[model samples]
Target: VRHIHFVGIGGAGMGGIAEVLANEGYQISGSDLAPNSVTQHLTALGAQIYFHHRPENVLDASVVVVSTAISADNPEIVAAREARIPVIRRAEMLAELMRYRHGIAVAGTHGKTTTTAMLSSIYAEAGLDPTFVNGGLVKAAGTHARLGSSRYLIAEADESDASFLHLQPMVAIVTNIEADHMDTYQGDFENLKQTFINFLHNLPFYGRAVMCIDDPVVRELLPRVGRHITTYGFSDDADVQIASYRQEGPQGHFTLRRQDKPLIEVTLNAPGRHNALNAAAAVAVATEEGIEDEDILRALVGFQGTGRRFDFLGNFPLAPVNGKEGSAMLVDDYGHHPTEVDATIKAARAGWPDKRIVMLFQPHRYTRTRDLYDDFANVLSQVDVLLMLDVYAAGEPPIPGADSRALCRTIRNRGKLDPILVPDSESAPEMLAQILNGEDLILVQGAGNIGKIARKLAEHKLQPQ
Candidate 1:
């Protein structure tokens, strides 16, 4: 299509797709509830951006694109449907972008963004010039998506609302499957698992499925997947095995061993065994594609990490409390699920075992808090000090007993620690100041407006010497 209109175009996923299409010389236009950096970037790229959605927004569009978050009653969507113009989901447009290329779709509950980015980086490093679309900003590229000059397309396949089924890639990667988005599966874990199996089944018969052997669910489904499979993990039986893994600050060092292939030494700038596994998965894909080992090594070590995934905002000096001298290292992450939060905590501990962890956590959605209550309690309690912010609704209504205060109470009864509840995220900075100490790692964690708060803290609240 020469002209494309988007509903809710400022979203990470939607914005990236718009940017890629805009770069490909299409006339792009869209509207969002608010203007942000994403919209500004799109405007710079010649996309006509609107601050509000209306039927007029799609008047001149050939096809209108929408994210899952957009409602069917949305003015722009309704207008397009009424006008008899084609209306499509974001993934549908993405699949079209990959239709003429060799596509790699990264699908899973966690690590999909980073894994997609890693593969993209590797391809770029190898001079493959592959087009890539990610759900998060690739820090190195300073953009979420790009229209490269080769016949390769790499993108994240989101399962959050089950729209990922729209993508049929030549190669599919499942980092791991979990129960975070139960609402999409009608609260049925089996259905969620089966959905992933179906996604893998979408790959061509000759296409490959790169999986994580360490994930029990993935291992269980291997017998059922009829496609060619390659597995990567810390597990010994993995086709691509990661060994001697070590994390020092933000750097991760590991050895990757694949059967009948030369042992490759790798170093990743991102920390955590989880990231090591992510790198291994990328390495497996590269090796299968005959990409040079040296190029893979360079990309992994040179990787700067994606936005908001263990993003370091520098070490800032905290105003002393109780005459104590100290500074806190401020970091922000977009991990709201219990499994994701646990991985971030483990990464922090492994990289800096001696630092005290003070976490400011804003639970993402009320549904998630209600569904994973005890899991959240168990994980949040692991932090040395916890500051809880109210749930970020994300368009969902509040559920009784699923708010942060209830979570604090549940964690308190478990007895490892007591959580300080900050009813308003805006008050978090002042509250954190009261508990400031030297050499503490302040983790600003969530998938909500709390990230804005973290940026505010980094830029103005906390002073670095």
Candidate 2:
């Protein structure tokens, strides 16, 4: 299509697709309720962006692209339908973009964004200069998407809404599988598992499936995948086995051993064993493609990280508690799921074992919170201090007993630590300042607007005094 229109264009997935298509010389125009950095960047790239959706927005467009989050009754979508213009999901457009390239679609519940960034970084380091579209910003690239002049296309295969099935990639990576977005699967976990298997089966027989065996679900489905397979993780039988893994502050050092190949020494600038595994997955992909080990190491070491994934927002001074010196390390992460929350907490503890961990968490959606309620209460109790914000909604209506206050009640009843519920993010900074103590690492965590809260806390403390 020459002229493309998008509904809810400012979303992570939709914006990335728009950016790549715009760079590919297509005329792109779209609308969102508000302009974000994504919309601003797209505007700079000649993509027309509207702050509000309108039927006229698609008048000159050849096709309309939309994410699963978009309402079927949206004015632009209705306009496209009325004009007889083809309307498609974002994944459909991404699939078309990958049809002619050697596509690598990274799919999983948690690590897909980081894995996509890692693979893109390594391919570029190897001088392959592959094109990439990511769900999150690749900090090193300063943008979420790019149009490189190569035969490779690296992207995240989103599973939340199961639209990733639209993509048929030559190489697919399943980092791990967990129950999420149950609404899309009719609230049946089995359907979710089968959907992942179906995504892996999308690869041609000659193609490869790079999977993480450490995840029991992935390992269990190994025999079901019809394509050639390779495995990476700390598991002993993994094809690419991670060894001697250690996390030192923001860096993780490890060695990956693949049979018949020299043990490859590696260092990743990002912290967490979860990330170490992510690096191994990338190394496996790079190795399968015959990329040089030196290039792989360079990419991993130089990898800056993705936006909102354990992003460090600088240290900030806290109003002293009990007259003791007060300051805390500030971090922001986009991890709303219990498993992801556990991983981030583990990373923080591993990096700063002696420090008290203070966390400000915002639940992303009512359905997710309701489904993983007890797990959330259990994990949030692990922190020294907890500040829970109102659920971010993400367009889902509220569910009874799934709101943050209910979650706080559960956690408080468990009695590991008292949970404090914040009325809103705007009040969080001052509330956090009151609770802060020396040597506490304050992590602002979620996939919502809480990221801005973290930055505000840092900026508040850094202001001229």
lDDT of 1 by residue, 254-342 (tens): 89998678888888989899999888889899999999888999998899789999999888655533245767898999998899999
Per-residue lDDT tens digits for candidate 2, residues 1-465, read 689988999988898889888888999999999898899999999998888878988988989889887788889998898999999999999999899999999999889999999999999999999999998899989988999999999999988678889898999999999776455546487788889989988898899999999999899999888889999999999999999999998899989999679897888989999999998999899999999988999999999889899988787655432244766788989898999999999999998899999999999999889988888888888899999899999888899998999988888887688888899667777677777788989889998889777667677662321
TM-score, cand. 1 vs. native: 0.96
Candidate lDDT values, in order? 0.89, 0.88
Task: Give the lDDT of residue 161 in candidate 1.
Answer: 64
Residue 447, model 1: lDDT of: 95
Where model 1 places Cα greater than 4 Å from the true spot, the runs are 181-187, 319-324, 461-465
| Clashing residue pairs, backbone N/CA/C < 3 A, model 2 | none
Candidate 1 displacement at residue 395 in angstroms: 1.9
